[PDB]
Structure formats: C-alpha cells, structure tokens
Amino acid sequence: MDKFRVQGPTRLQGEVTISGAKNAALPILFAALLAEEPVEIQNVPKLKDIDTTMKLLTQLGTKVERXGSVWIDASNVNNFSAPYDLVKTMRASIWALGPLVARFGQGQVSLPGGSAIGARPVDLHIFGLEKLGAEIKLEEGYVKASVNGRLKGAHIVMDKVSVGATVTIMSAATLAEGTTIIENAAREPEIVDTANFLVALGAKISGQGTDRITIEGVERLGGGVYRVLPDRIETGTFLVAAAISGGKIVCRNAQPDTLDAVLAKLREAGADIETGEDWISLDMHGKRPKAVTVRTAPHPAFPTDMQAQFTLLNLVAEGTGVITETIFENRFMHVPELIRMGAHAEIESNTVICHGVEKLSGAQVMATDLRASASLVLAGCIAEGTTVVDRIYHIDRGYERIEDKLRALGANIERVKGE
C-alpha cells in the first residue's frame, strides 16, 4: 500500500504539462471499435484503465500497441463478447457494447452485480440501445444486445443527464440508418471530444457540447489520427496548487475553454491569470487566496470534480466561503481530514462553510475519492510539517504520476512503498 509523505510548506511554481483526459481517451478508445481503418489516438495518458481497455480491445480481435499514442487496428474485430475477467475492474467497459452492436450486430458485456436496483449506471445505456432498435437480453451479471439488420435512428429523450449513456447512444447512432436526436444530452468536453473523434472517422454529428445532439448515420467509419483533449480536472488541480501556495505556474498542453467557470473562480480568489491557445498561467504574486463562493452544477458550470480542491483553497484563504455541492450528496470526506490538519469548517447538509486559516499542520490522512485524495496531497504541500497520505493508488489511477509533476514545481514529496 503506497503512500505519499509530503513535507511543507512549499511554494509551488514552474511549469507542468497537462496529460490527455482519461475520461475522453476511454470513450474514444471504445469508439475506435467502429473504425474499419487504422487509427492513431494521440495524447493518451498511461493509466490503469487505459491498460485494461487495451487488453479488452485485444481480446475482441483488435490489434493494439502504444508508446504517447495508442495505435488501433479494428479492421478484424472478431469476438464480440467482453468477459468478466477483463471488465470487472472497470465500469467504462460498458462502452464496448454499443459499437459492437452498431457495427457487427451483436455484443455482450459482463457487468459487476449488486443488490441495489433502479438507476444502476448501465440502465440508460441499455434503454438507449433499445430505442435504436437493439434487442436486449439481461441475466444477472451480463447484458447482451443484437440487432436484426442495422440500428435505426431515433429521437431519444434522456430523463437525466448521463455522460455514459450519451456516449453509448451517440457512438452507436453513427452507423444507424437515419437520424438520431438525443435530448438532454450531457455537455461535458469529453462528450465533445468523443463526438469530434467520431466525425474525424467519417461520422455526421452536430450539437455536441449543447443539450441536443443530432447524428446522421453513415454506412461505415474509416480511420485517421486524433488527439485526445487535455485533462481539465488535472489542469484545475495544478492551478489550485499554485493558487493556495502563493505560487506561479504555467500549465502547458491545456485547453482554457473547458475551464471557464474554474478560471473565473480562481480570479475571484485573487489569481492573476492569462490564457493562450494551449496554455494557462496563474500567478498569485505571493498572496494568500481570497475565499470564494462555489456552487457545483452540470458542465459548463463549476465542476464537482474541482469541489474538494476549492474547499481546500477556501480553508487556507482570507475570509469565509461556502461550497455547495449539488451533484453528489456525500462528497465531503476531505473535510474531516483537513479539520484534522487544523482547518475550520462546518458541514450543513449539502454545503461546507469554510473559515480560512493561515497555515495547516501535517497529519496522517486518507480519502478514497480521487479528487479528495489529490486535495490532501496539495494540503500536504502547504502545511507545516509532514503529511502522510495513505492509499495513494486512488490518485495513481486518475493522475499520471502526480508526485513527479508536483516535485518539479518544488514540492517535497516521496512515494513510500508500505511505510
């Protein structure tokens, strides 16, 4: 069980290169199952789910190899069943289903079970494919889908916003006969990226980024080269790292327009920010941040995946700021840990009232949520003394070696294997 021993305080300054977003690479890699010709997917991070996905695609008959790019040749996919042993560690595996049924007429994916029923993640994927004409068969543990002929474009109205089902429906719709219209579509930049990838292969999609996506089916998709967009959450994490340590940083290989709400909030906290075509710089001019008011909401509003980081920012800022979480009902586990680090905060239902203090003190802390864990590592960078963040594998699965990026910004951090 690896942990990070972090010693502070350190002002974080310098440059950091933003990695491709795993949440865009994953749906794009599964979308590549639709490609009849070789595809090169650029800027793919080296993370566990990517390895899991490459192994799964290989099991389906895809030829795959990687470095910064992942090269895919799906011309001869010939096994349309994704087995339990290859999907069990990854929910994103459901994304193999739509492309398999859309292109080959059959697909099956094993699904981890549960005693809980109703609103299980895969339900909207299933019902969306059913609306496109697929015949769905369910037995605990798996979903099999097939279609007699080609899928048929349909007007689908999503009752709740779902990034996963939007990707499944949009991707499968690219090879359906006719027009598919998705109402209340998820607007996330990763949806836009997946849509642009499909268009690069020959698909006809418009409206990506808005609540209504229109797909005009085509007979087949080809191949090409496509670069995965930058990880907007990783970017926000490094911007916050500088913002809370009186730092100065330049985030390279970034995409500013996927972060409008985050950059606006950082400017409210007192940051001097400039943006370029593929970069964002932030300078606190050595000052402590000013507390801000945050309300998470669906993209393009402020992202829940930046909530823990901004709570930390408020907890060392000047003033009182309230963070309201409207997306998840229990995403505040970082708070007790920070309070153990000397922070002053009160939880009131779906909000945390923060009363900024000048300095935190090191402690042994841990959070299972990826963003909460990474925020503890950032708190460790500015706290006096030693902070030990346990169960760092959560971070490793969503950030490409965060400690090396932080160390290059001046952090004193080390991976301790065990203790």
Using CB under 6 A, list all residues that contact ligand HAI.
80-81, 106-108, 144
Ramachandran bin of 206, using left for φ above 0, alpha for ψ from -120 to 50, beta for the remaining angles: beta
Q: What do you get for the CA distance between the two ends of the chain, in Å?
A: 8
For helices 232-243 and 307-315, what crossing angle results, to 10°?
A: 0
Query: Residue 153 Cβ, how far from ligand HAI at the closest point, in Å?
Result: 23
Provide φ and ψ at 332, rounded to 5°.
-125, 20
For helices 123-131 and 97-104, what crossing angle results, to 10°?
A: 20
Query: Residue 133 Cβ, how far from ligand HAI at the closest point, in Å?
Result: 16
For ligand HAI, the closer of residues 144 and 248 by Cβ is: 144
Q: Which residues of 124-136 are buried (b: 16+ CB within 10 A; e: fewer)?
A: bbbbbbebbbbee
* 122 CA to centre of own chain: 18
Query: Residue 53 Cβ, how far from ligand HAI at the closest point, in Å?
Result: 18
Euclidean distance between CA atoms 278 and 284, whole angstroms: 21
For ligand HAI, the closer of residues 141 and 276 by Cβ is: 141
DSSP letter assigned to residue 367: -
- Which neighbouring-strand residues pair with 358? none
Query: Residue 78 Cβ, how far from ligand HAI at the closest point, in Å?
Result: 10
Three-state DSSP class for 8? strand
For ligand HAI, the closer of residues 108 and 196 by Cβ is: 108
Interacting residues of 330 by C-beta distance below 8 A, sequence separation 6+: none
Q: What is the CA radius of gyration of the chain?
A: 22
Query: Residue 99 Cβ, how far from ligand HAI at the closest point, in Å?
Result: 12
Query: Residue 106 Cβ, how far from ligand HAI at the closest point, in Å?
Result: 4
Three-state DSSP class for 369? coil
For ligand HAI, the closer of residues 87 and 365 by Cβ is: 87
- Order of strands, edge to edge, in the sheet holding 272-275? 13-17, 248-252, 279-283, 272-275
Q: Are 242 and 234 in contact (CB under 8 A)?
A: no
Query: Residue 168 Cβ, how far from ligand HAI at the closest point, in Å?
Result: 16
Query: Residue 117 Cβ, how far from ligand HAI at the closest point, in Å?
Result: 24
For ligand HAI, the closer of residues 70 and 145 by Cβ is: 145
